[PDB]
Design a protein around this nucleic acid. Structure first.
Ligand SMILES: Nc1ncnc2c1ncn2[C@@H]1O[C@H](COP(=O)(O)OP(=O)(O)OP(=O)(O)O)[C@@H](O)[C@H]1O
Ligand SMILES: Nc1ncnc2c1ncn2[C@@H]1O[C@H](COP(=O)(O)OP(=O)(O)OP(=O)(O)O)[C@@H](O)[C@H]1O
Ligand SMILES: [Mg+2]
Ligand SMILES: [Mg+2]
Ligand SMILES: [Zn+2]
Ligand SMILES: [Zn+2]
Lengths: 49, 643, 651
DNA sequence: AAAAAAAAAAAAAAAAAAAAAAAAAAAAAAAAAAAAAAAAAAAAAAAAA
């Protein structure tokens, strides 16, 4: 946990990042709901099975 | 829902026994004759008028207009089946594609085995061996649609739209069937092309190369393949059919085959065709779904309403037009018919008619003198200069109208712009190129940019445009006559200053104009009352007050002018001295006076081309002395207002 | 897996509630009438005010505003049932009947800046300006195929999975038969709906000053597509949703969000007014009862806060009413628009008249001398930069088609700009061309301009030509020119100062209670509805602090708006007595000897002056709702032109 | 008549190969977009009698 000062020179448009996702299987249509997403600039690899 | 074998029999029946009395009242089979003509390869395009189909099967016309691509295919099938029984001799093989068709047909006969059933792929594609092409002419019971309102509910339907052509690509070959040969077998492979792109084949599928299980790589070649003349245009909504706060909408028209080379940019056209989609797959599409672009697959392209075509080849007309052209007051009647809602300006309208007709271009021992008449209406405020210019724009076949600086710079000249069929840099012309052999009406000529005035110099005399800028290095080709409108130096003629100090044109530009007309409106009770009565009648009834001669319709004026245009008259030697004396006298009085414009040899050339135009209006083949007299009189009336 | 819902209790309750709300026949049948009316004029979208739904069923209203697709599909099922009950043939003629929403959204009224992720899958109202429209593309919803080998015809449906998971089997376009026989598509038998994406930006005058703008992507589906063009201030109601990404294997967790429009509307100032039968009766009563002095009653009631300038106000009423455009058979055109120029001393309320017409007139566009420069005033030609093609851009005077451009500080406008507007001010069109594109845009507008004379103040001792710094070509197409002069007469000062001080003491009833200050700050606007797209009207204003008391009333602003809208449509025809009078009047005006010495011409008299006599007489006749241009109309026109065209030079 | 036999002959358990079925299964490359900056042409406003 750091505390730094500074001046803000750009502010992106507010966008939508998922905190929980649900995925559905293409054949049996069963769902794998409420998968928790890591906060920050971190992605998610879907289950391969 | 419906059975297409029965529909094919229906269209065969229509093609075989529809008749009309078109041939001078003689009853002809309208489409059987054409089946004969295109069985002997003397015709390519068959325009199936749907009004003819509707005479005896309106349900068929409904089906056609609702699917319109199934039925184009059906009609092509039916005519292709009818052609052998309409062939009364052996085609002379006028073409190179014909040799390929003949060799393929002969080989197919040679290895026939009539009872043996060959694979569905072991045949020639229909499109490979047609040589004709079939188009619909929309039923007149279909009211034309507006480009904006041709939407997804009319995909696949035959629609008719009209608008200005803004942009036409060049004619280039579109692959219809890609032909391949193999390096092992000796069979040809055909790949009919429907998409805008295709992956060329690699391995051949022929029977021999499958039996042998050989490599059999196949090679794409242009020589046996089928191309079609292809051309893509952009067409735009007409101004009086755009919503209020809007800009006009475009539509892509894909023109192929015999409909190419009809529309040029600037043309008013009516296009009949099928509104069709292009799958538009490939992008990083934001939205899931099968989104696609649209285009009008042109079937019939008809220039109209200022660029009417067929009347030109139909110069033969009624005995009436013979009798009016023979009349002596024909020139006065044509002049009076120019903008009848504008009152007065009789001599101005005579000069404008001369600009429309034009003189004869000379090409003596490589030193070109242009027969174009350029006119400038240098007038007071509110003397109907813009109305005359707008009328002449609506009248002349290839006319562009330009006001102060909306069409400045490359809006007059050309520019290099990216295309789409080839993705390279094409050259697009502006107003001076869109009016290459017509009139360019320059309103507010005096408030024009100096670069554009310089370009107008070089256009007016050399009839080209030389551009040597970065992206562009060309000599465009601008054979137009300039109709300019301007105000005197301070917006109104000032009698306290000199004539050229009011004109505010340099001698070079002032000499570029064969006729420069001063239009002053001094008030006077009688003439002002007459002008007011004319104007108030026009407001009251939306027409000019009736006079002794009904003004000609703008179609008749175009036909009369166009019929005059191909009437090159020659100045005889017997007039040489008369013309020279008139020029010398004019030249002498130019510097005798202290209130005269620049005069030069161009003044002689103006006399000469004005008199040639006047001779042309009388349909004579030599210029007489009355033409030179009328030219002289118009040249004085141009400055008569000064008195 | 393919299942069906045998029983969805929620769907049943929702559909029953929505059909119950729609039946409406017991409750003065407003939606009963609305549905019969959309059946009548051959539409298939029903615009539903959520205030009515909130009245009839508040639980549905909350559920619908908060769970937009579930509730909207329930409500569209209910709507199709209602239409089928009213008319089964029309109902079967359309596959889907859509419901658009309207009214007051409490916190669901946002801008592209305040539209955040707490609104996903909710119905929201977003206001902004269109920055880019896409092309209108057809999207295939039902593809029909024919196999020539087997003569079979098949059809394949594509559900709208725009904001739902799409599995790749959902989007396969059939090319082959099961026997691998080539299929060919029946384009005229297939069904396509058209699709368009726009981007809505926060309005520049609503955004925080100095920050970059925020936008939202908006999807428009069939019958909503061409409803907006770039530069329009629109209100879009729809569902806010997160778009599916492409089938990956790794996701960053980021979703593109989008608004799926269920209704698009323009500024309600430019929309066709609603006319209750009582309103038409009142208009007919007004016109018939007071016919001689109806024009003056309307004129002096124009800008009540401005004292005096009665001739200017008559002319501005004529501008608001307009002449009648002539459309000759050969395509020739004569304008019916009146152009007015006000030149005057500083602070004589001419910027106020311009502003009044901006508030009142439909399709009025503001501009200042150097705020618009050519291309920004008339059209423009740019290149699409992503397709390489020329694109036309409408400037101020194209956007003011069938409207007014209110040009202020017209004198400080550069000379090239005034040259540019010459062609619009007479022909009502903008001719524009670069090499790849040429167009002739319609700009049928009337110009109301305010200028100051040379030297800032008018010089009573100089000719109006020497004092208006404009040339006869520019002046002559201003068909009325008013020198609004600051004379420091003391009784005139009595009158004006009294009126002005009286306007600076008036409090609006109820809203003001004694010391209130009006302002709200950047949140209070979104707190309540916008009075720009928002949906009993008297005739005369009641007496108040605006006027002291007298035997002459004041036409209500709302009634005047309705009356002027009705009267503007009229096309009075010039009679022969009017035509003779106008012709002789013009002939007399042209001859200077009729007009005194020491009296100069403000603007020249040309054939345009005759055309404007006709236009003003026609506008007067419109005010009386005459259908004929009578001699009183011609006399009023001539007296207005006589007042405007001459000024007394002093010494 | 019953008393040893001496087979069927049924079961449980084994083998014992087949032949079919079942189970495992991310990272590397590309492209597009959106943003920048740069050469050129083009369009403005200060100069003066
Ligand atoms: N002789 C005339 N006959 C009929 N109408 C006229 C005549 N003179 C002027 N008008 C009318 O006056 C109006 C103004 O005409 P127009 O705009 O052509 O003037 P202009 O010559 O272009 O003036 P400027 O030099 O200011 O451009 C038009 O609507 C036209 O109908
Ligand atoms: N006759 C009048 N009646 C009512 N208010 C007036 C009158 N004359 C001036 N005013 C007041 O003067 C103030 C300034 O008016 P405005 O800004 O319209 O002047 P202007 O004529 O545009 O000045 P300029 O020509 O310098 O732009 C306004 O608030 C207006 O209320
Ligand atoms: Mg003009
Ligand atoms: Mg002001
Ligand atoms: Zn599964
Ligand atoms: Zn081979």
């Amino acid at each position: 946990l750091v505390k730094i000062p500074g001046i803000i020179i750009a502010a992106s448009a507010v966008r939508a990042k998922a905190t929980r996702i649900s995925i559905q299987c293409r054949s049996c249509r069963n769902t794998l709901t409420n998968i928790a997403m890591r906060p920050g600039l971190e992605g998610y690899a879907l289950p391969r099975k | 829902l419906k059975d297409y074998a029965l529909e094919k029999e229906k269209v065969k029946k229509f093609l075989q026994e529809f008749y009309q009395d078109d041939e001078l009242g003689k009853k002809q089979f309208k489409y059987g004759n054409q089946l004969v003509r295109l069985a002997h390869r003397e015709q390519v395009a068959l325009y199936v008028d749907l009004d003819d189909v509707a005479e005896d099967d309106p349900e068929l016309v409904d089906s056609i207009c609702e699917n319109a691509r199934r039925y184009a295919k059906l009609f092509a099938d039916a005519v292709q089946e009818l052609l052998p029984q309409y062939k009364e001799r052996e085609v002379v093989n006028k073409d190179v594609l014909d040799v390929y068709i003949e060799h393929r047909l002969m080989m197919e006969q040679r290895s026939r085995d009539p009872g043996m059933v060959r694979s569905p792929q072991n045949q020639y594609p229909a499109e490979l061996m047609r040589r004709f092409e079939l188009y619909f002419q929309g039923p007149s019971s279909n009211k034309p649609r507006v480009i904006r309102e041709v939407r997804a509910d009319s995909v696949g339907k035959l629609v008719t739209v009209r608008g200005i052509v803004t942009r036409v690509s060049e004619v280039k070959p579109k692959m219809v069937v890609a032909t391949y040969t193999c390096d092992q077998c000796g069979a040809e492979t055909y790949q009919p092309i429907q998409s805008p792109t295709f992956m060329p084949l690699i391995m051949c599928p022929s029977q021999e190369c499958q039996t042998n299980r050989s490599g059999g790589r196949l090679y794409l070649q242009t020589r046996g393949s089928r191309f079609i003349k292809f051309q893509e245009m952009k067409m735009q909504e007409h101004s009086d059919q755009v919503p209020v706060g809007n800009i006009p909408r475009s539509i892509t028209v894909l023109v192929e085959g015999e409909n190419t080379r009809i529309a040029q940019p600037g043309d008013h056209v009516s296009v009949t065709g099928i509104f069709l989609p292009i799958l538009r797959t490939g992008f990083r599409q934001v939205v899931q779904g099968l989104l696609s672009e649209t285009y009008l697959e042109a079937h019939r392209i008809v220039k109209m309403n200022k660029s009417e075509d067929d009347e030109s080849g139909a110069g033969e007309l009624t005995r009436e037009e013979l009798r009016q052209i023979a009349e002596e007051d024909f020139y006065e009647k044509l002049a009076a018919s120019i903008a009848p809602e504008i009152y007065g300006h009789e001599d101005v309208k005579k000069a404008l008619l001369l600009l429309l007709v034009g003189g004869v271009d000379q090409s003596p021992r490589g030193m070109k003198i242009r027969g174009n008449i350029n006119i400038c209406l240098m007038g007071d405020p509110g003397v109907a200069k813009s109305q005359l210019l707008s009328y002449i724009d609506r009248l002349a076949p290839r006319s562009q109208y330009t006001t102060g600086r909306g069409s400045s710079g490359v809006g007059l000249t050309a520019a290099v712009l990216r295309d789409s069929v080839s993705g390279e840099l094409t050259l697009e012309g502006g107003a001076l190129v869109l009016a290459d052999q017509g009139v360019c009406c320059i309103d507010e000529f005096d408030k024009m940019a100096e670069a554009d005035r310089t370009a107008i110099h070089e256009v007016m005399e050399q009839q080209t445009i030389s551009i040597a800028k970065a992206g562009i290095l060309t000599t465009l080709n601008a054979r137009c006559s300039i109709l300019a409108a301007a105000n005197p130096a301070y917006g109104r003629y000032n009698p306290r200053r000199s004539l050229e100090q009011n004109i505010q044109l340099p001698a070079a530009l002032l000499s570029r104009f064969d006729l420069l007309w001063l239009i002053q409106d001094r008030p006077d009770r009688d003439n002002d009352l007459r002008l007011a009565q004319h104007i108030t009648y026009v407001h009251q009834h939306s027409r000019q007050p009736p006079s002794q001669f009904e003004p000609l319709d703008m179609k008749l004026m175009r036909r009369y002018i166009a019929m005059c245009r191909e009437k090159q008259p020659m100045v005889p030697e017997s007039l040489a001295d008369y013309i020279t004396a008139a020029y010398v006298e004019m030249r002498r009085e130019a510097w005798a006076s202290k209130d005269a414009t620049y005069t030069s040899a161009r003044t002689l050339l103006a006399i000469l081309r004005l008199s040639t135009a006047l001779a042309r209006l009388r349909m004579v083949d030599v210029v007489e002395k009355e033409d030179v007299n009328e030219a002289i009189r118009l040249m004085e009336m141009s400055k008569d207002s000064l008195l | 897996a393919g299942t069906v819902v045998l029983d969805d209790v929620e769907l049943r309750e929702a559909q029953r509630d929505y059909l119950d709300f729609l039946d409406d026949e017991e409750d003065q049948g407003i939606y009963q009438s609305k549905v019969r009316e959309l059946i009548s004029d051959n539409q298939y979208r029903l615009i539903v005010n959520v205030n009515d739904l909130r009245r009839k069923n508040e639980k549905r209203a909350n559920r619908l505003l908060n769970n937009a697709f579930e509730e909207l599909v329930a409500f569209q099922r209910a709507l199709k049932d209602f239409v089928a009950s009213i008319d089964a043939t029309y109902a079967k003629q359309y596959e889907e009947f859509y419901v658009g929403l309207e009214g007051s959204f409490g916190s669901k009224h946002v801008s592209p800046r305040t539209l955040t992720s707490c609104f996903l899958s909710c119905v929201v109202c977003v206001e902004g300006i269109v920055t880019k429209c896409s092309l209108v593309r057809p999207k295939v919803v039902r593809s029909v195929h024919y196999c020539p080998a087997t003569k079979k015809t098949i059809e394949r449906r594509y559900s709208d999975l725009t904001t739902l998971v799409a599995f790749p089997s959902s989007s396969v376009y059939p090319t082959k038969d099961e026997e691998n026989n080539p299929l060919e598509t029946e384009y005229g038998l297939s069904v396509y709906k058209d699709h368009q994406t726009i981007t809505i930006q926060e309005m520049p005058e609503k955004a925080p000053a100095g920050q970059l703008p925020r936008s939202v992507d908006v999807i428009l589906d069939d019958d909503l597509v061409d409803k907006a063009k770039p530069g329009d201030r629109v209100q879009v109601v729809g569902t806010y949703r997160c778009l599916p990404g492409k089938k990956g294997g790794y996701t960053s967790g980021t979703f593109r969000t989008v608004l799926i429009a269920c209704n698009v509307k323009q500024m309600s100032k430019d929309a066709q007014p609603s006319f209750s039968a009582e309103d038409i009766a009142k208009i007919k009563k007004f016109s018939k009862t007071r016919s001689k002095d109806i024009f003056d009653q309307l004129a002096k009631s124009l800008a009540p806060s401005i004292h005096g300038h009665d001739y200017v106000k008559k002319a501005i009423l004529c501008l608001l009413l307009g002449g009648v455009e002539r459309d000759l058979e050969n395509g020739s055109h004569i304008r019916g628009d009146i152009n007015i120029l006000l030149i005057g001393d500083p602070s004589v309320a001419k910027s106020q008249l311009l502003r009044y017409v901006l508030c009142t007139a439909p399709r009025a566009i503001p501009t200042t001398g150097r705020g618009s420069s050519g291309v920004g005033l008339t059209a423009a030609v740019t290149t699409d930069q992503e397709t390489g093609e020329r694109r036309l851009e409408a400037g101020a005077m194209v956007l003011a088609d069938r409207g007014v451009v209110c040009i202020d500080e017209f004198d400080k406008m550069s000379d090239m700009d005034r040259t540019a507007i010459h062609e619009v001010m007479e022909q009502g069109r903008v001719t524009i061309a670069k090499a790849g594109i040429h167009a002739r845009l319609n700009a049928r507008c009337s110009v109301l301009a305010a200028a100051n004379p040379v030297y800032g103040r008018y010089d009573q001792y100089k000719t109006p030509m020497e004092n208006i710094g404009l040339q006869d070509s520019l002046l002559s197409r201003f068909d009325l020119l008013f020198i609004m002069l600051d004379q420091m007469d003391p009784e005139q000062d009595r009158e004006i100062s009294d009126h002005v001080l009286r306007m600076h003491r008036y409090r609006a009833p109820g809203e003001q209670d004694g010391d209130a200050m009006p302002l709200g700050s950047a949140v209070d606007i979104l707190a309540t509805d916008d009075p720009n797209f928002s949906q009993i009207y008297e005739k005369h204003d009641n007496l108040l602090h605006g006027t002291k008391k007298k035997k002459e009333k004041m036409v209500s602003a709302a009634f005047m708006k309705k009356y002027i809208h009705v009267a503007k449509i009229i096309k009075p025809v010039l009679t022969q007595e009017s035509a003779t009078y106008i012709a002789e009047e013009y002939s007399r005006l042209r001859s200077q000897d009729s007009m005194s010495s020491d009296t100069a011409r403000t603007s020249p008299v040309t054939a345009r002056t005759l055309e404007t006599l006709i236009r003003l007489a026609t506008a007067h006749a419109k005010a009386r709702m005459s259908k004929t241009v009578d001699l009183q109309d011609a006399e009023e026109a001539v007296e207005l032109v006589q007042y405007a065209y001459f000024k007394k030079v002093l010494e």
